[PDB]
Amino acid sequence: TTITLYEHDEKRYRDIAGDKKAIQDALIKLNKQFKKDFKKLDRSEDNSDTEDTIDESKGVVEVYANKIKARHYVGFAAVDNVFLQILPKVFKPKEDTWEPILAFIRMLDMAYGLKIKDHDLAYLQGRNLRPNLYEVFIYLFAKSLWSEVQRGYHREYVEVHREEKFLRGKLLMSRQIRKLPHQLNTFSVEVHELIEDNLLNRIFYASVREALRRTTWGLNRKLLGELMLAFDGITPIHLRTEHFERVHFTRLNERFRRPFELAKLLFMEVSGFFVDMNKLFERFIERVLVRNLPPEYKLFYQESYPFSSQKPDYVVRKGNTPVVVLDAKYRELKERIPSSDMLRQLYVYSRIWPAVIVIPSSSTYNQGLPDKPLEFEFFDERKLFIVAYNMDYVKTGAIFKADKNFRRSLNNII
Amino acid sequence: NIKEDYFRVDMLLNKKGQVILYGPPGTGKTWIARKYVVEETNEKTPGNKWEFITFHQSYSYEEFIEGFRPRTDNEEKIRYVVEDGIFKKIALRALVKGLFELEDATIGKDKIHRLYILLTKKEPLSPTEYEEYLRLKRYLWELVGGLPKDKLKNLTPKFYLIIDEINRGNISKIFGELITLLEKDKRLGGENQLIVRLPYSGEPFAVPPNLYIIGTMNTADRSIALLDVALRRRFAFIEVEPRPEFLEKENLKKIREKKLKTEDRKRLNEKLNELFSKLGNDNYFLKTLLEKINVRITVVKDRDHRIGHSYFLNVETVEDLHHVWYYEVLPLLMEYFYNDWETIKWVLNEKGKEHGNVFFEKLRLTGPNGEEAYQLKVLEGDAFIGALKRII
Amino acid sequence: NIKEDYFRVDMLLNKKGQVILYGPPGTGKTWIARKYVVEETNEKTPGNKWEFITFHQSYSYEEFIEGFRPRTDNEEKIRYVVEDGIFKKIALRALVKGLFELEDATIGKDKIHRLYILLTKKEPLSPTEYEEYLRLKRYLWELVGGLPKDKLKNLTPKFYLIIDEINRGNISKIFGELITLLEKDKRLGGENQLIVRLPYSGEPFAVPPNLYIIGTMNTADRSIALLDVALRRRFAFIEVEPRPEFLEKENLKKIREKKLKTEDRKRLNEKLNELFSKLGNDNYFLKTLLEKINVRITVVKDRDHRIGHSYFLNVETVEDLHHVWYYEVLPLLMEYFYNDWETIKWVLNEKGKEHGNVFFEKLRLTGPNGEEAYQLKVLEGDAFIGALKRII
Amino acid sequence: IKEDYFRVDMLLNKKGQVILYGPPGTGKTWIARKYVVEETNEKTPGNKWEFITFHQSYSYEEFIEGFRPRTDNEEKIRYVVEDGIFKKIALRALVKGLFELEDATIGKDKIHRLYILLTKKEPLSPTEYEEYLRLKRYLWELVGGLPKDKLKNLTPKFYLIIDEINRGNISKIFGELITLLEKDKRLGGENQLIVRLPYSGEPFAVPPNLYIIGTMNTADRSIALLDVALRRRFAFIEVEPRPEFLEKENLKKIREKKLKTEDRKRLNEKLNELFSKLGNDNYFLKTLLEKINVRITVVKDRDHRIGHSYFLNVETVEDLHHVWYYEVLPLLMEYFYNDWETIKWVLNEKGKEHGNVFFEKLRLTGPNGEEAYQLKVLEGDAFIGALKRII
Amino acid sequence: PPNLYIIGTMNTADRSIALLDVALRRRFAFIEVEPRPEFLEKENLKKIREKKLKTEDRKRLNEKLNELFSKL
Amino acid sequence: KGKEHGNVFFEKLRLTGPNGEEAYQLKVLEGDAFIGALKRII
Amino acid sequence: EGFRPRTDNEEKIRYVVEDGIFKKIALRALVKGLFELEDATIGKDKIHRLYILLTKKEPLSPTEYEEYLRL
Amino acid sequence: EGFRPRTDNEEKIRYVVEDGIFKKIALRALVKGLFELEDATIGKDKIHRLYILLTKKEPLSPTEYEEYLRL
Amino acid sequence: EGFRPRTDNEEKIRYVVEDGIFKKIALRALVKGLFELEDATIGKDKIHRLYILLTKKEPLSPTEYEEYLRL
Ligand SMILES: Nc1nc2c(ncn2[C@@H]2O[C@H](COP(=O)(O)OP(=O)(O)OP(O)(O)=S)[C@@H](O)[C@H]2O)c(=O)[nH]1
Ligand SMILES: Nc1nc2c(ncn2[C@@H]2O[C@H](COP(=O)(O)OP(=O)(O)OP(O)(O)=S)[C@@H](O)[C@H]2O)c(=O)[nH]1
Ligand SMILES: Nc1nc2c(ncn2[C@@H]2O[C@H](COP(=O)(O)OP(=O)(O)O)[C@@H](O)[C@H]2O)c(=O)[nH]1
Ligand SMILES: [Mg+2]
Ligand SMILES: [Mg+2]
Ligand SMILES: [Mg+2]
């Protein structure tokens, strides 16, 4: 069964496909698996409460008696033929669930640091496939591999001190001089032969073999079927985490960086990955600000310690003199005013940095939308200047029209 | 319609110089290449005018052109004389056999005929005549460089070389000196005559315009990720399609009677009439079965993974069709789809069927995470024919 | 011929010392390396003035400049001697031929002539004269140590080493010592005369300024491409783009009658007039056909996987264009886009077409999970030109 | 000028063996060849210094010692162990250092007999090779009975200037030398090591004369000296690609160093004609290499920078055109193979698509919305206007 | 010669039949020797062990197998 | 980590990459300014 | 088929080509099959000499090995 | 087993087949097994001679190596 | 321990077995160990003859290696 969630959204167990007992068995393994692998991913003002909440089967999904509720952890996971995918709530609409997939991967393209191509994703737009995050990241792995295997096969050179019936390469002399004449019929050479089954090819044969076994499309089954035939002579391996560390990216296999990072993102039971929606917006806004703020340079994660260090998500300073704090919040900001938890942190970030502070918030049809300019000016009775900026999201499309509107509102703010 | 396939090879082999009969296995690519050379140069065996040679994964350049090899010398201790491979024993042979018919006033025809004897010698070279072989080979490449390009295009004996399974070996490593030479222009006598200096023996070497290197590439193994520049431009690729037109009643009768004898063709007529009467009196059954199963292969997987037509070409009864479907089609079908079951039953259009007359029946015990494993099921008699009559 | 690709090789090889003609397959890279050296040295065969070798993955460092190679003597069969490769037999040949017209070798001009005989000797070196060869070699590097740099700047011959497919071998390993000699001011006579010490023989070695190295690498493959940044400085890369301008009506008559200067110029001209008259009297058809494929390959594939102008150069008739399409470049296009059918339909500009006069017909049978693949169609006649007029 | 010369001379007395590492295209082999020539007054290799260079087939058996068949009699091929390139230097640098000592090494007839059999270019006959192998056993019986004060100060400085030290498998080539390449583990040091060789079994120790100045490139990161125990031995001199030499005056000072005022007047008016076409600015090629090396530092790494061996041999604007389109733009395209919006940014033509751009945009597009550019060969003064926009 | 038949034997716990070399899945013809549990009955285990032993060993083999399956 | 200019071994290059990357360069110091860049480690 | 060393009456090592397993069973299947052929009776004495030599073990001297290579 | 040179005559260095450890221990187990067997009494006075040659803790002498070969 | 060819002045290549670094320390520690005590190590001149033939700087002659193998 395929189940899909948006951030802070619920599904009924009666309407859902499959079995009632089957889905709740899949989740308790996933929330437990998120507990052991929680510390690998960074957060930003998450209020995670690592001791109590995550180990109570509330790590990724809150499984309840009457419904199934998603926390603010975005991504996907495939467990026990119950494929779960959690999209952001910002891309929620009012092919009907194919626009938020390419919106989320493009927000996973710019924020998280991936180097995927837009024409890789635009190939899938309109082919009426079943929307699934695991079916597209296997495709993004398989297409970027088959576009990097079609040119060259990555045959890397190792040297072997082999006793050959012929003579290839440099003849070892200290091993041939001390050769008895009863065994003179084989040369003892040290040939730098190119092997096809290197460590990077043992991984990509194993990463395809664990992908074709767990794929469900008709496009990925054809593409991984051609990749497995190209890797036919390679002896297979069992994938571990030691194999993904033992290879290093030099200049002669640098073009295999794009399929390998996606092969490390999906393989290392469980499959997939999860990230916090607060930090992914904190990373995504950081791409927008430094591009859109020419007058003043901006650094993310600068920290100033009170008295326990409370650090802004981003601060922009021209040289050192202007202190314009920019704290990225994923909150909906209901009733056109910041909440108690938000404005209390905005007060501290301005005071310990005469410092204006701007809060960027999400804006679409689903999320709360303010007017086009800088919506809310606030003073906290200390000559402060709190500006509520809102970035519109044309990221569901491929054109960046809202970046010009975000620059025009920031130019009036700067 | 096989003389056009002996003309499709023949029109490309005088224009590009060498071909590759690429196609799915069980088609006749080895048989078309072998029965074209035997029909052209009337020599039923290898050796003199053509040499059959297959490739493998551990085949190296030193076995093909030349390499240092230990060789015994008159039942005594070994020496380390450099041995010419299987190509250089026929590339030099195609030169010195063509240089008989050339009437020039500089040919050492007594010396060239002595070199031709030492090249066709089936025994290995003894050191009393190996130095006579290397000295006469030195006279050959002093003579070839002195002949003009006008007298090195019309060499009469067409030498051949059936490279079987050319994609199985590493093609760019075997053809070391033969991905700069195997063009029609880079041969001897052409406009771009190149005599390439070899690394091991140190003597210059150039392919003559007689040698045509026919290749028979299986493409269900070590697929189309080829060299794509060197081993793809030189070879004029001929697709040998798996033709189900040879699987009718008359076409199976015509194939198995021409190679047959007097008493064999009457028994092959009685056997094939018994076979197709058990199938439903369908004279076009095995054609329609192979054509239907080939369309399902080219839709799901690649178009060059189709089941060929050399398998069903040697059937005479239902029991022989059973032993070619369960040992040369269904193990071959489970090889292409990498032990998949939900798409291997759509090829037989048995996607929504289980436990009946199906070639892959579902086991009635699912796994822990809801997975299911199918199992091959042997059939017999009219149950198997009813399992074949719903593939169409 | 002398306009661009000759006058920019000769200017750049005389300035840098080494030229690599990198470019996609089907372009005149081996040809412009062969034509430039033969038109310079006036020797249409290898040997004395120039040597044409080619690299591969079985090529050794020990067989290039210096290595231990076991020879076959008479009474001691296994005798391990150090044998100079092909580069040390062309670098020492370029040195002792250039040192015939010097004025500081006045004690051993007979010794330099005797050393030149031992290097031009194609017979294998007997061990009674190999020590005479080694005594003259260590006399040579004593003589260039006492030679001034003003007299080693101008050596009047011009020796060449056309290595072909340089990028195939392990170029960091084959050029062992040559990764610090191959520069214009690091040969003999340059501003930094470097005489390095070879490992095996223990004799010093330095590339003369007489020598030039014209590599022709291929850049369609990527796992063998030359990314050694310390080696790309030594060479001087010349991109030979595949020019479709050699496929016009006036250009095919000028390229094919320059080489074939026989009395068949009336035969080629009336055949090339008949070929383009069947193409709609379009004198720029094959120029437009190769241009509208190479641009459409550049945008989706890499820019170095383009179709060269050596496929469509040897066309004569529509029957010959049909043979070079369906058997050389259409299996090549199915190798670039291997079961990526929406791309290969678009490269031939048949994206919306799925029936009729088209190369790839759509199958009328879709798959289980919504996949769909196409099928070749062997066209002929004016319908084939109607399938080529849609590309341009 | 003499700063890189003196910096090599300081570290070759402190650590013992210097390594000039840097991006390819700078003066690494040149400042290593000019150092050894100006310090030993010997322009060709020989006794006082020997140039070698490493590769993957430069194994241990031919560098220090290994078995080598050698008979010099055309009969009775004697399978004897012969010393490599290094041990023929370190034994030569020792027995040349045992001349100037007064009375510590009492071998004044037996050391000079060993030196004349070590510098002998003709290969050793077996009637004198038994003398060479017997005197070498006397040498390591002599060394060991000398005080460290009469062994630390050996006068004549020997140099084994090697090249591409990273290119060979350096932990395999350096065998017994992996523990002897410190300044205090040599002969005469505080902790001398008479280490034993495997094959011949005769002991061995490096003299304090022999300095190993070894140049390497660090753009190939596939083969860089990452062994952390062969970075303690060597002293790593940074040789960055310095664009200060590509001025008008600094290019006139370098290129007119050895011409004897014959072609120097031709070179002076040729550089006057080059910079008159670049815009009458003496500082063009300095900031051209600077704005490329900075823009290639922030993208690829610090180590893939364009050197100054490319642009140093330009004379006219035509020779700059033939070093741009044929040496560095094919180099810039193979850093970024089919990575087009990056290589457009190194030339900072990122908004520029058509016109005087090196990479014009193809008028076609893709089926999935992709695009790719095409290299545009520019000529004339339009090439300089396409080049001055980089600065 | 056409006499020489090549009867292979393949322990496929480590290497599957799809993981062979490509000139082994087409030149040869594969027979799956399935693990038959029907050789482990009470009467089938007696008949298999009756071929190797003698007559007096068979009554001891009969009594031991009767002692085995009574405990199970 | 916060020092990007002045007495520091690695100055920051003034421009960033096209997609948010930024590299440094090894600044050679001398004298007491080197010690002032060394005593801030401890 | 391969190379294998062999002593010649306590002398230096003499290399000789000794057939492996597959060639010793393929040649044995040939010379045993030519007994019951009516056309191969032109050399029935010499073929039978080969079959006795091909089933015995350790050919000790070259006088029967050169007989073996002649047959 | 493999080939080793021996201390034969001066100009007559010979390559014999000196047995290793596994052949020597399996022969020694076979010789000691047949030494106490009842039906192998045809040459039991020579099997004890072969046992002394196999427990000989030194390289075998060339004047009696053929006695080891014949036994 | 390994094999090593050794042609001295005019003899043939007699393939001697040369002890490596470790056995020339292990035998040298054992022989210098037994040289100081006297419980049952008879032949103190014989043990001293083995110690001289272990600290030889020159390679061993075949008239001296054979007595070194016996000791
Ligand atoms: N006359 C003439 N012929 C040309 C020209 N360019 C290519 N050709 C022809 O192309 C043919 C082969 O081109 P070639 O140079 O050999 O490709 P290549 O460099 O070897 O291709 P690769 O596989 O190594 S990558 C030759 O027959 C030659 O006649 C040209 O500019 N003029
Ligand atoms: N006068 C002068 N010439 C220089 C200087 N730097 C480089 N050159 C010149 O540039 C040329 C190339 O420099 P070179 O030393 O050979 O580069 P490299 O470091 O050795 O190149 P690599 O492949 O080993 S990494 C030399 O001929 C040298 O004359 C310099 O600072 N002063
Ligand atoms: N008579 C006849 N037999 C054919 C034809 N095509 C194939 N065969 C048969 O196919 C068999 C050879 O198959 P082969 O070429 O080895 O298949 P492949 O090499 O794996 O592609 C032979 O036994 C032929 O009898 C044909 O056109 N006519
Ligand atoms: Mg075949
Ligand atoms: Mg070529
Ligand atoms: Mg260098």
Author numbering:
A (entry chain G): 5 to 98, 107 to 280, 290 to 328, 335 to 380, 393 to 453
B (entry chain F), C (entry chain E): 193 to 584
D (entry chain D): 194 to 584
E (entry chain A): 400 to 471
F (entry chain C): 543 to 584
G (entry chain A), H (entry chain B), I (entry chain C): 258 to 328
Q: What did the article's authors report about this structure?
A:
To overcome this limitation, we produced complexes containing full-length TgMcrC bound to the AAA+ domain of TgMcrB (TgMcrBAAAC) in the presence of GTPγS. This assembly was structurally more homogeneous and allowed us to calculate maps of the “half”-complex at 3.7-Å resolution, as well as a C2-symmetrized map of the entire TgMcrBAAAC tetradecameric complex at 4.2-Å resolution. In support of this notion, we find GDP at the A/B site in our EcMcrBC structure, the F/A site in the structure of the TgMcrBC complex, and at both sites in the structure of the TgMcrBAAAC complex. The loose A/B and F/A sites represent low-affinity, post-hydrolysis states that allow for free exchange of GTP and GDP, consistent with McrB not requiring a guanine nucleotide exchange factor.
